[PDB]
């Protein structure tokens, strides 16, 4: 079975809309989402569909760009670090679960190289 997806809505969690979070949506997420290699990362890993009952035994902090997109569009975050951590969790989960050189790892590595380039240019808070 698949676990429930990560939280994307919680009225108890305090929220902000900042210029760094806007950059994460309008520059970072947009660039990565349109990459040719983005598609396996655009929704939670579907262990049922892939017949991978082991995935959620190994990966206990799942994350994906569909969840991140919802968090950004629905103003779930307080700060940019929360969102950057989600991206980093997504990449590291892929490297933990899969073998070096696997197609999915090469795809994640291409997205991560672009992510790092965009994050290096993160604007100062206004
Ligand atoms: C032991 C074999 O290892 C794997 O198959 N690994 C991985 C596979 C895929 C993957 C493939 C095909 C499809 C159709 C999907 N779609 S989805 C997002 O709905 O689940 C995902 N994503 N993936 C991610 C992220 N991280 N690892 C993997």
Curated annotation (Swiss-Prot):
Chromatin reader protein that recognizes and binds acetylated histones and plays a key role in transmission of epigenetic memory across cell divisions and transcription regulation. Remains associated with acetylated chromatin throughout the entire cell cycle and provides epigenetic memory for postmitotic G1 gene transcription by preserving acetylated chromatin status and maintaining high-order chromatin structure. During interphase, plays a key role in regulating the transcription of signal-inducible genes by associating with the P-TEFb complex and recruiting it to promoters. This is Bromodomain-containing protein 4. Interacts with p53/TP53; the interaction is direct. Interacts (via CTD region) with CDK9 and CCNT1, acting as an associated component of P-TEFb complex. Interacts with RELA (when acetylated at 'Lys-310'). Interacts (via NET domain) with NSD3, CHD4, BICRA and ATAD5. The interaction with BICRA bridges BRD4 to the GBAF complex. Interacts (via NET domain) with JMJD6 (via JmjC and N-terminal domains); the interaction is stronger in presence of ssRNA and recruits JMJD6 on distal enhancers. Interacts with NSD3. Interacts with NIPBL. Phosphorylation by CK2 disrupt the intramolecular binding between the bromo domain 2 and the NPS region and promotes binding between the NPS and the BID regions, leading to activate the protein and promote binding to acetylated histones. In absence of phosphorylation, BRD4 does not localize to p53/TP53 target gene promoters, phosphorylation promoting recruitment to p53/TP53 target promoters. The NET domain mediates interaction with a number of chromatin proteins involved in transcription regulation (NSD3, JMJD6, CHD4, GLTSCR1 and ATAD5). Ubiquitously expressed. JQ1, a thieno-triazolo-1,4-diazepine derivative, and I-BET, a benzodiazepine derivative, have been tested on tumors with success. Treatment with GSK1210151A (I-BET151, a I-BET derivative) has strong effets on mixed lineage leukemia and promotes myeloid differentiation and leukemia stem-cell depletion. Belongs to the BET family. Residues 16-122 form the Bromo domain. It is linked to Cornelia de Lange syndrome 6: A form of Cornelia de Lange syndrome, a clinically heterogeneous developmental disorder associated with malformations affecting multiple systems. It is characterized by facial dysmorphisms, abnormal hands and feet, growth delay, cognitive retardation, hirsutism, gastroesophageal dysfunction and cardiac, ophthalmologic and genitourinary anomalies. CDLS6 inheritance is autosomal dominant. A chromosomal aberration involving BRD4 is found in a rare, aggressive, and lethal carcinoma arising in midline organs of young people. Translocation t(15;19)(q14;p13) with NUTM1 which produces a BRD4-NUTM1 fusion protein. It comes from Homo sapiens (Human). It is found in: Nucleus; Chromosome. Changing residue 103 to G: Found in a patient with a neurodevelopmental syndrome; uncertain significance. The record marks 98 as: Acetylated histone binding. It comes from the Eukaryota. There is a cross-link at residue 57 (Glycyl lysine isopeptide (Lys-Gly) (interchain with G-Cter in SUMO2)). The chain holds residues 44 to 168 of 1362 of the full protein.
